Amino acid sequence: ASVYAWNRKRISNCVADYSVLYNSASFSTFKCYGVSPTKLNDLCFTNVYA
Amino acid sequence: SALGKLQDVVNQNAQALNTLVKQLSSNFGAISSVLNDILSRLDPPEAEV
């Protein structure tokens, strides 16, 4: 969608892996705020968005 | 309420200890007040601050 009408996607009740995205070598920028690009496959979250 | 100064000293010591304990739940400008959570969420180079 556009920038002013971005689509929010709720993610819950699932197991999410993030190491396959950081090591994909396709994403230009992968800046993490509050968390680290690693040590995230060992944590569990309550409600994330996309 | 006969023994006043003794109870006052005991209450002052208890309040000092309670304040020293409760000063661990503060962030002081950090992300959180839990050192283990900080170490588990951020890598050392970013969690040093």
| Alpha carbon distance B12, A26 (integer Å) | 61
The first and second tokens of residue A17, run together, are 């892996």
The first and second tokens of residue B21, run together, are 């304990």
Are A34 and B31 a contacting pair, CB within 8 Å?
yes
- Using a 10 angstrom Cβ sphere, with 0-12 exposed, 13-18 middle and 19 or more buried, the burial of residue B43 is middle
Contact residues on chain A for B40, CB-CB shorter than 8 A: 39, 42-43
**Nearest-CA neighbor of A47 among A16, A21, A3?**
A16
At residue A11, the 3 state secondary structure works out as strand
Are B41 and B31 a contacting pair, CB within 8 Å?
yes
Mutate to test the interface with B, among A18, A35, A40 (most CBs of B within 10 A): A35
> Which residue in B has a C-alpha nearest to residue A42's C-alpha?
B40
Q: Where are the beta strands (DSSP E) in chain A?
A: 10-11, 48-49
Are B40 and A43 a contacting pair, CB within 8 Å?
yes
Its sign, for the CA torsion A10, A12, A16, A18, is positive
